[PDB]
Amino acid sequence: NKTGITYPEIKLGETGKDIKTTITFMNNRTDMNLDTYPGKNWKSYIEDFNKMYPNITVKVQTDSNYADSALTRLQANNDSWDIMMIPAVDKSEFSNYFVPYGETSEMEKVIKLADEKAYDGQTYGIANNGVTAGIVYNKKVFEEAGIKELPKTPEEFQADLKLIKEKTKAVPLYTNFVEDWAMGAWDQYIAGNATGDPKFMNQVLPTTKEPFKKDASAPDTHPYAVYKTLYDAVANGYTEEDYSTTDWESSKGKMNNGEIATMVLGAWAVPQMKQAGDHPDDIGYMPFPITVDGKQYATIAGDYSYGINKNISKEKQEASMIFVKWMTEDSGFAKNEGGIPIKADETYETFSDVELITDAPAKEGQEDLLANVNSDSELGINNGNGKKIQDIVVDAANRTRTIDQIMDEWNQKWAKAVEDN
């Protein structure tokens, strides 16, 4: 764990000014690890970081398959890395792997989302950026299609997709099927966004046996409504022609240039689309098309969080925590990359009527319930089991199963796991 120098105590520019080492920072931003990156690349951020700390050297390592490779590395339990973006590992294991930045109580004072990546009152991960759950869209394609107001319900959304399919040349909704994480992203919409309830994720979901079934009183809400949105898009012919060959890098330029109308991704994705071509002002961001009793909701959550390897020397832990502190407070990464800065001190107009909510903690003694039901059901809700979402695309496309049948398969597995825990 930490060496007696806590994240709130770091005097930026003062502390650790005497250290001379190299630290290794693993992250998912392969694009930023190139000199071609359209915006501010890693070299630049570290160029600026060294203006203030010339003798802390930072080796940036990036992997396209980040979730699996970071987890494998994490499980190897060595000192081959100093910082990584934290992969899909249960919070109860953070103590095994990561250095605590400090008591959550105190991190709250200095950072947003202090209890997102935390256990037993200590905060082990700091979000690199706060991201809102919405949809990236091409405004020009929408006009071309004669869409006037943005869709707020699943039926409105499919009607708009159909307009795009019939009156434009753009793929209405591009799944990015081959990217496991892009499919896993649909789970970022099923709790706050689909229910308006900040307690859904950590309380209602893991105490509900069959949460994926159609909500009978409000059938256009709740997780079913999200997953059906994907199913219907694929099955009605509103997605790419060949899901098996989607290409994520290509799709940026394609949406910039009007060849794609929508992609269901978090707000981090907007500037990446904007810089992919000459048509940045054509990219917008809209709320996900669910309305709950007259209001729309969008969950704010962390993008990848920084984690510090607990196996490294006291000296390397410190320089790591300093580079985090700097990235957080002085780099300006989070804006530049299209989200909410995490240092604790007005977004798209399309969201001005959206209630922004964040998941609340479980009740006392139930903090580990979701992770345990998730593990036993093997559904991996909001982990990066993109696999079950890939399953939706495949079966909607080959028409072998209805969404009701898919959701019932998940419920049976979830319901066993709920009773078991």
Ligand X SMILES: OC[C@H]1O[C@@H](O[C@H]2[C@H](O)[C@H](O)[C@H](O[C@H]3[C@H](O)[C@H](O)[C@H](O)O[C@@H]3CO)O[C@@H]2CO)[C@@H](O)[C@@H](O)[C@@H]1O
- Binding interface with ligand X (CB under 6 A): 28-31, 64, 66, 131, 181, 184-185, 266, 268, 272, 301-304, 384
Closer Cβ to ligand X, 67 or 354, answer by number:
67
Determine which residue in the list 35, 36, 217, 241 makes contact with Zn ion, applying CB under 5 A.
Answer: 217
CB of 215 to Zn ion, least distance (A): 5
Q: Burial, 380: exposed, middle or buried (Cβ in 10 Å; 0-12, 13-18, 19+)? A: middle
Q: Report if residue 245 touches Zn ion, rule: CB under 5 A.
A: no
- 37 makes contact, choosing from ligand X, Zn ion, none, with CB < 5 to 8 Å by partner type, with none
Q: Is 76 exposed, middle or buried (0-12, 13-18, 19+ CB in 10 A)?
A: exposed
Q: How far apart are CA 159 and CA 151, in angstroms?
A: 9
Q: Which two tokens stand for residue 299?
A: 């969950």
Terminal alpha carbon distance of the chain: 29
d(CA 355, CA 287): 10
Instruction: Describe the strand order of the beta sheet including 354-357 as a list of residue ranges.
Output: 130-132, 296-302, 354-357
| 120 lies in the site for Zn ion, by CB under 5 A | no
Could you tell me which of 213, 212, 192, 194 has the C-alpha nearest to residue 203?
Answer: 192
Please list, in sequence order, all residues whose beta carbon lies within 8 angstroms of the beta carbon of residue 261, skipping any fewer than 6 positions away: 137, 138, 141, 142, 145, 161, 164, 168, 170, 171, 172, 173, 255
Bridge partner residues of 57 (DSSP): 22
Q: At closest approach, how far in Å is the CB of 29 from ligand X?
A: 5
β-bridge partners, 151: none
Q: Where are the beta strands (DSSP E) in 145-206?
A: 171-173
Q: Among residue numbers 354 through 373, which ones bind Zn ion (CB under 5 A)?
A: 372
* Residue closer to ligand X (CB basis): 133 or 147: 133
Q: Using the rule CB under 5 A, give the single segment among 39-47, 197-205, 243-251, 286-294 that binds Zn ion.
A: 286-294
**What are the percentages of helix, strand and coil residues in the chain, rounded to 5?**
45, 15, 40
Residue 270, Cβ density class (10 Å: 0-12 exposed, 13-18 middle, ≥19 buried): buried
**293 lies in the site for Zn ion, by CB under 5 A:** yes
Q: Considering beta carbons, is residue 269 or 319 the nearer one to ligand X?
A: 269
Closest distance between ligand X and the C-beta of residue 63, in Å? 8
Choose between 82 and 180: whose C-beta lies nearer to Zn ion.
Answer: 180
Nearer to Zn ion by C-beta: 30 or 44? 30
Nearer to ligand X, 87 or 206 (CB): 87
One character per residue 177-216, x = contact with Zn ion (rule: CB under 5 A): ---x----------------------------------x-
**Closest distance between ligand X and the C-beta of residue 298, in Å?**
13
# residues contacting Zn ion (CB under 5 A): 8
What does 245 bind: ligand X, Zn ion, none (CB cut-off 5 to 8 Å by kind)?
none
Is residue 395 a contact residue for Zn ion (CB under 5 A)? yes
- Please choose, out of 76-84, 155-163, 227-235, 413-421, the segment that lies near Zn ion by the rule CB under 5 A: 413-421
Q: Which is nearer to ligand X, 30 or 153 (by Cβ)?
A: 30
